[PDB]
Amino acid sequence: FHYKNVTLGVPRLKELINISKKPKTPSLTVFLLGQSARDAERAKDILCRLEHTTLRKVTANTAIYYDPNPQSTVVAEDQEWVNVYYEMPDFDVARISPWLLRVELDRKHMTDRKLTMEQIAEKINAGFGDDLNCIFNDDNAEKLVLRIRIMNSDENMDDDVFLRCIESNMLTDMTL
Amino acid sequence: VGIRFCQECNNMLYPKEDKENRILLYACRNCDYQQEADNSCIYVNKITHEVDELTQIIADVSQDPTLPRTEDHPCQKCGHKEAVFFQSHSARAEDAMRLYYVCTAPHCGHRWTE
Amino acid sequence: EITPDLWQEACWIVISSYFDEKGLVRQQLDSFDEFIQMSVQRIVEDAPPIDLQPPRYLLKFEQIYLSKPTHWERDGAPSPMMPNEARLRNLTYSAPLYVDITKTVIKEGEEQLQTQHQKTFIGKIPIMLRSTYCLLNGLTDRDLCELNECPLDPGGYFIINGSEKVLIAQEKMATNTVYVFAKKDSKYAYTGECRSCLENSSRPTSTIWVSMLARGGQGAKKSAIGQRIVATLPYIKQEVPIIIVFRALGFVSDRDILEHIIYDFEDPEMMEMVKPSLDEAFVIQEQNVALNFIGSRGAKPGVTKEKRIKYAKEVLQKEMLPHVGVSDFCETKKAYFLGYMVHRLLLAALGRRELDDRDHYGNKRLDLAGPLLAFLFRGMFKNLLKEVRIYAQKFIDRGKDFNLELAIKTRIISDGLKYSLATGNWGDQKKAHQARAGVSQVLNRLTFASTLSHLRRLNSPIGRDGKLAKPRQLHNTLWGMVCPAETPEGHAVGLVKNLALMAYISVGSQPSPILEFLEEWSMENLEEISPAAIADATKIFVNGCWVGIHKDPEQLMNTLRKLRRQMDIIVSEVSMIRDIREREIRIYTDAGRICRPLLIVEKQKLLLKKRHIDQLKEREYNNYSWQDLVASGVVEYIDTLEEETVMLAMTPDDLQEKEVAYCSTYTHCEIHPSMILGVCASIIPFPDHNQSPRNTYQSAMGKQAMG
Amino acid sequence: AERGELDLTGAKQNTGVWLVKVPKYLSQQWAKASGRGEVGKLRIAKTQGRTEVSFTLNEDLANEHPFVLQSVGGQTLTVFTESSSDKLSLEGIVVQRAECRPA
Amino acid sequence: GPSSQNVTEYVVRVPKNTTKKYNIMAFNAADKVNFATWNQARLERDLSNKPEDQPWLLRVNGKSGRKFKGIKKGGVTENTSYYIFTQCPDGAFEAFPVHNWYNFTPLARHRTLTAEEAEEEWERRNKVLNHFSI
Amino acid sequence: ESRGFVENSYLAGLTPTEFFFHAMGGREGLIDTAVKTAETGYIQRRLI
Ligand SMILES: [Zn+2]
């Protein structure tokens, strides 16, 4: 009780005497080679890259709206950057699916790990398939928003239940 | 964000989509009562969970004989110079050492953090 | 009129008043007098008649008598046995038991012939020494010495085959309340519990869980809807969704169900959590098909339909929450309570209220000799009626006649009690494998302070070798009710414990006179109210049962209290809790709660004026004692639960002086802080100067000193 | 004209009735109703900010009961009958509920 | 107004007999039923129970009208009797005993469902969820 | 004061709300010794 968490005394002795496949507190001491071993910034970035970051550690909220056309935007501010997207709209080949997903991001946990929306949106598109569409803001703004739509090439499987299913699957399964 | 009950059989109204006027329709699955949606949003999920408990604490806590009191911070809405303070006493206890106050004057019930 | 700094001689003059009246083993003597004046009359009175058959017969029992302990000589001449001969001749100290039986024959033979046989012999009950039914009750020292008895002997034990047996109080989890835990190993993310028993009338106690499945269920679309609230009813094999069991009581609509579970519809965060509970109980949408669903999986799978609809009817009516009501009527109450049980499970998932503690000593009850012998007397009175039938049917098919004095097997009750007491296993003779052992051990007579420390001892029934520390460590709630230093070493560390000097265990009473006062003090019943007038009201519980609401609690509370202070309607051993935050009020009247007296404090001054002392040092020829002190509202018994809504001062002359002070709203004050020690640990001089493990050794070592 | 036919006259007349809760001991006094069935007299005093109703026992029945008016809101109450000729009739809708308590 | 300054006194009688048993017929206020819409009604004891104990079956408007089921309350005179007080032309009050309390609730005529069919549907739906995954 | 700092000594004596805490700490050590002996009588024996 008196000393991280490492087991000592009797229970670690009876973990070493048999070969128990789940030790109660395993660890892995990590040494460094080059310039990363002396400066604190490089070592910290390496630790961030190593430690596992699921998507829900860098999210604020997820809100499923209903915009049948992207030019409606019941959301009271987001017509500006999807109007920047509306200067040249892309991927309206089959239809337009109305059911939308919308993630806000928290910049303390985001800038803590040196991440951005471009490699998150690179990961959640290249890696899942092409079943979604991931649009996002510019880094000038304070809030970080990325809108997600389902692919129209199936509508040419109710998409409310389906879109909540990928909403509660992308929050837990992304491994950034 | 709320919930909708049917006006005939008093059950839960589900959202549905019609391919005619592009408007959200709330339907029932026992009868088929219908109506349109005014806010046109269905699901919302708050993960920050930064709800300020100023909306959850009750005004009658100032009747507790086991809570500390103060003469320093007076009430603003009535000017009473006696308050009773405490902590969050709930979840979200990562950095939770704030100090919510409640005025102790009868029939004031004013609450405020600092 | 105040008592300034004469306190050190004043606190020891009220403590003398306590022990001169109560004594040290009133724990044992009061639970016995209860079991034998009330708890035995109710068992035979509340028993089903044995109508049996052409003609048919009647038999029902009316009144019970007892006589003083008696010994039948070799030639059949009785004589009262004194407790000493019972020790010398290896006798047993017991008393015979009678009853009045009436027998009416019903053959509609133009006449209803009834007859009765009063004072019929049944058996023999052991007698605890120095009780109100012993031969030593109320004797003077000149007569106690004349029978060769010690005037200092405390009493409170049985004499069984020469030996001297003592019953150990067993601990037990409190009943009729909702507890929320979290099993972090199994499929459940949260769980509720409620052990119910309908006022000392059921051999078992039906328990019901209200679970909630885990979030990380590896699946496809269960991922989107979320966790589903489940229930595990008794006497059924499979889990059941809650909306189904709700509809089996009526309430098929989903606007009426979701007002028993959610009390205010301005809360979107909770309604979102109950939404995925309706989706799976959506296709089954009427009463009779619901009863079939639960009725399909029982102790017997129904082959037909009507039997399942019959089978599911009573199990949901006589095994679900029997403490609320067991009658087939009043099923709106079983709906509200089942709703409150679920409303409280959601609050533990949103993180608005903390989980319950298992070892918090306010959730425990104690089984003295009373609630232990009464449990053993039921299983042997039913067993005596089960074998009057077997003798009547064999004897009435031949149609001759009936005679009852030959039907009663008297060896059932006599040898039934005497066996389990003498050997300890709390069961039956052919049941020497299904019983709880360790009760009823032999009195220790090594030194006089090893005798007293045996009649005051608890025991937690957990295993004697389990390595889990949380049932063994010392808990904050043991202040003033269990001795902190006295415990044995070895394998039983912290499993047996001794109770402090002034700790007092309650005996029990009936909630009838408080209910009749509550209704006339503006308390709306549950039926005649609208579920929208429930958000700003304080739900009023009584003994575990939700019995109404109220809209001005703070004036109800200090009206309930000033009635108890002067003892008009409410006895002094009931506890009345009010928690401001959760907005409810609880009241208890049952037996097993542990109390201790304190001094009542008004604005900042004690209520014990000097007028009470100079007339309390005169009890010898004034007839003013402890009882006239409680009935004047200067002391008060305080339970463990009630002890969380109180603010104590440890000493008057030092903590109740106006200054830049710690607190200013003191509600009670202690008598002397030295009454937190047991019996064997209060003979140590200067115990506040030693290291702690040293005080534990001596308290387990002064029990084996010759004297 | 049929057994299962319910008269709706009372309801359609909007006929009103009063509902009063009475203790059994008083009700036992009332089973001994004086004369044809008279039990006493009811007194009603209404003021600008206070209304008082009470009942006083018949002198014969004796050998003040204030009323507590109770709300009927939240649940519509009506009275329906079954004759000794088993005919069915709706007499009215409940316009008042009340409880007799001693003084 | 007279509700404020109104005053009066009336005689109360409790007749030891009546020509008809008196019961209470209770409706949920939340429904706000227009009794004027009740052109006719039928009222019969419920047939599921295949008499005095029988729940009532109320059929509004003869052939084409609403339907309610009335369920008897557990008790009505277990501690206190309920009385109907009626005003008479002589101003005096007449009191009538309440024999019983029946609870009336609205009925959902539309829809028809099966147990075996419902269970079968549930498994297929459950199965569809597990199919076509990742 | 509220959570266990015993600021007196063994010669100046202990206050009540402080003797109770010292009894809690001494209790935990007594439980540890009993559990340790059972563990010792097995692990070492099996290895031999
Ligand atoms: Zn509907």
Ligand SMILES: [Zn+2]
């Ligand atoms: Zn104020």
